[PDB]
Design an enzyme around this catalytic site. Structure first.
Site, PDB file in Angstrom:
ATOM      1  N   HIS A   1       0.989  -1.063  -0.059  1.00 38.05           N
ATOM      2  CA  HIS A   1       0.011  -0.070  -0.059  1.00 38.05           C
ATOM      3  C   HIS A   1       0.839   1.315  -0.007  1.00 38.05           C
ATOM      4  O   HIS A   1       2.046   1.173  -0.241  1.00 38.05           O
ATOM      5  CB  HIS A   1      -1.010   0.020   1.012  1.00 38.05           C
ATOM      6  CG  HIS A   1      -0.647   0.057   2.548  1.00 38.05           C
ATOM      7  ND1 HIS A   1       0.065  -0.953   3.310  1.00 38.05           N
ATOM      8  CD2 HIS A   1      -0.768   1.392   3.245  1.00 38.05           C
ATOM      9  CE1 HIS A   1       0.411  -0.171   4.528  1.00 38.05           C
ATOM     10  NE2 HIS A   1      -0.057   1.161   4.309  1.00 38.05           N
TER      11      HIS A   1
ATOM     12  N   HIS B   1       1.431   3.761   1.866  1.00 33.10           N
ATOM     13  CA  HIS B   1       2.116   4.349   3.337  1.00 33.10           C
ATOM     14  C   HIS B   1       3.459   4.399   3.222  1.00 33.10           C
ATOM     15  O   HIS B   1       4.328   3.461   2.532  1.00 33.10           O
ATOM     16  CB  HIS B   1       1.694   3.872   4.385  1.00 33.10           C
ATOM     17  CG  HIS B   1       0.049   4.320   5.011  1.00 33.10           C
ATOM     18  ND1 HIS B   1      -0.673   3.591   5.655  1.00 33.10           N
ATOM     19  CD2 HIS B   1      -0.538   5.581   4.285  1.00 33.10           C
ATOM     20  CE1 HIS B   1      -1.688   4.377   5.721  1.00 33.10           C
ATOM     21  NE2 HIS B   1      -1.441   5.392   4.904  1.00 33.10           N
TER      22      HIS B   1
ATOM     23  N   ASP C   1       5.766   3.650   5.103  1.00 34.46           N
ATOM     24  CA  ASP C   1       6.456   2.475   5.619  1.00 34.46           C
ATOM     25  C   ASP C   1       6.729   1.198   4.603  1.00 34.46           C
ATOM     26  O   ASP C   1       7.731   0.478   4.607  1.00 34.46           O
ATOM     27  CB  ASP C   1       5.921   2.011   7.172  1.00 34.46           C
ATOM     28  CG  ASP C   1       4.722   1.440   6.790  1.00 34.46           C
ATOM     29  OD1 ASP C   1       3.685   1.951   5.979  1.00 34.46           O
ATOM     30  OD2 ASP C   1       4.206   0.540   7.435  1.00 34.46           O
TER      31      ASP C   1
ATOM     32  N   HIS D   1      -6.885  -1.698   6.101  1.00 35.08           N
ATOM     33  CA  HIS D   1      -5.982  -0.951   6.636  1.00 35.08           C
ATOM     34  C   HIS D   1      -5.799   0.632   5.719  1.00 35.08           C
ATOM     35  O   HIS D   1      -5.731   1.703   6.124  1.00 35.08           O
ATOM     36  CB  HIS D   1      -4.643  -1.643   6.879  1.00 35.08           C
ATOM     37  CG  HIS D   1      -3.575  -0.561   7.080  1.00 35.08           C
ATOM     38  ND1 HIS D   1      -3.103  -0.056   8.340  1.00 35.08           N
ATOM     39  CD2 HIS D   1      -2.584   0.044   6.414  1.00 35.08           C
ATOM     40  CE1 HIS D   1      -2.239   0.776   8.448  1.00 35.08           C
ATOM     41  NE2 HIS D   1      -1.839   0.694   7.135  1.00 35.08           N
TER      42      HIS D   1
ATOM     43  N   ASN E   1      -2.472   2.238  13.461  1.00 34.67           N
ATOM     44  CA  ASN E   1      -2.924   3.608  12.566  1.00 34.67           C
ATOM     45  C   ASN E   1      -4.071   3.335  11.566  1.00 34.67           C
ATOM     46  O   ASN E   1      -3.878   2.546  10.603  1.00 34.67           O
ATOM     47  CB  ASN E   1      -1.706   4.125  11.708  1.00 34.67           C
ATOM     48  CG  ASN E   1      -2.265   5.352  10.922  1.00 34.67           C
ATOM     49  OD1 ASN E   1      -3.074   6.203  11.356  1.00 34.67           O
ATOM     50  ND2 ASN E   1      -1.643   5.383   9.552  1.00 34.67           N
TER      51      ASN E   1
HETATM   52 ZN   LIG Z   1      -0.044   1.920   6.240  1.00 35.40          ZN
END
Ligand SMILES: [Zn+2]
Ligand SMILES: [Zn+2]
Length: 229
Positions: free
Chosen positions: A82, A84, A86, A147, A178
């Site tokens: 995804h 994000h 990270d 998520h 998160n």
């Molecule tokens: Zn994430």
């Protein structure tokens, strides 16, 4: 399995799950706490497919160095599950090393809007919940929003390994992480799609922490529902 006990911040360890299947574990320091993050490595002939970065340029360079030392086969393709930071942070390091980086068009668009690094190649055929595509030695599956709206999960049929990224929580996490970008309303249904497609999965890797079995899916729905309420 490696924990932050064995992994200093900025270091990466590999864990061999099966012939030609590893997880990569990196120790991340964020907002006062430290936690381990998982990704996946799957052998494809004499090459490697990488799932997710190690969060950031430094960690991802360490990941490539650890792969070079432990495995010695080249990482030729990478998928980010995804948008994000990270999971895409470190894509630029991968690209500079000659890895072809991939993500869905949704992930690429969201990464761009967020100002994150953007995988070069687009994964087509994953825009609708329940879509699956074959990608070398893995299947990529878009289970629906969870998520994040773009999150993919990865299945290794040869080893019955399911990597959930942050759509799947480890058992020790009993409250939601998160969820600023999450679809809490759809997350349990997206987990059900994962269960329906991979009911034979034997080794389930959450985005962070200890792997387990398919009960990590029910664990995640329990936690998501408790947060919803
Ligand atoms: Zn994430
Ligand atoms: Zn539980």
């Amino acid at each position: 399995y490696p924990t932050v006990s064995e992994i200093p911040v900025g270091e990466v360890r590999l864990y061999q799950i099966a012939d030609g299947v590893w997880s990569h574990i990196a120790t991340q320091s964020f907002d006062g706490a430290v936690y381990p993050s998982n990704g996946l490595i799957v052998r494809d002939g004499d090459e490697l497919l990488l799932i997710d970065t190690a969060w950031g340029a430094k960690n991802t360079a360490a990941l490539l160095a650890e792969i070079e030392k432990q495995i010695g086969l080249p990482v030729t393709r990478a998928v980010s599950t995804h948008f994000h930071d990270d999971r895409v942070g470190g894509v630029d390091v991968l690209r500079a090393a000659g890895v072809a980086t991939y993500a869905s068009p949704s992930t690429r668009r969201l990464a761009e809007v967020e100002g994150n690094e953007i995988p070069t190649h687009s994964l087509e055929g994953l825009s609708s919940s329940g879509d699956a595509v074959r990608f070398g030695p893995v299947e990529l599956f878009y289970p629906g929003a969870a998520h994040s709206t773009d999150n993919l999960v990865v299945y290794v049929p040869s080893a019955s390994v399911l990597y959930g990224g942050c759509a799947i929580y480890e058992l020790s996490r009993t409250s939601a992480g998160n969820v600023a970008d999450a679809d809490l309303a759809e997350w349990p249904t997206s987990i059900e799609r994962i269960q329906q497609r991979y009911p034979e999965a034997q080794f389930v890797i959450p985005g962070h922490g200890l792997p387990g079995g398919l009960d990590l899916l029910k664990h995640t729905t329990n936690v998501v529902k408790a947060h919803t309420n």
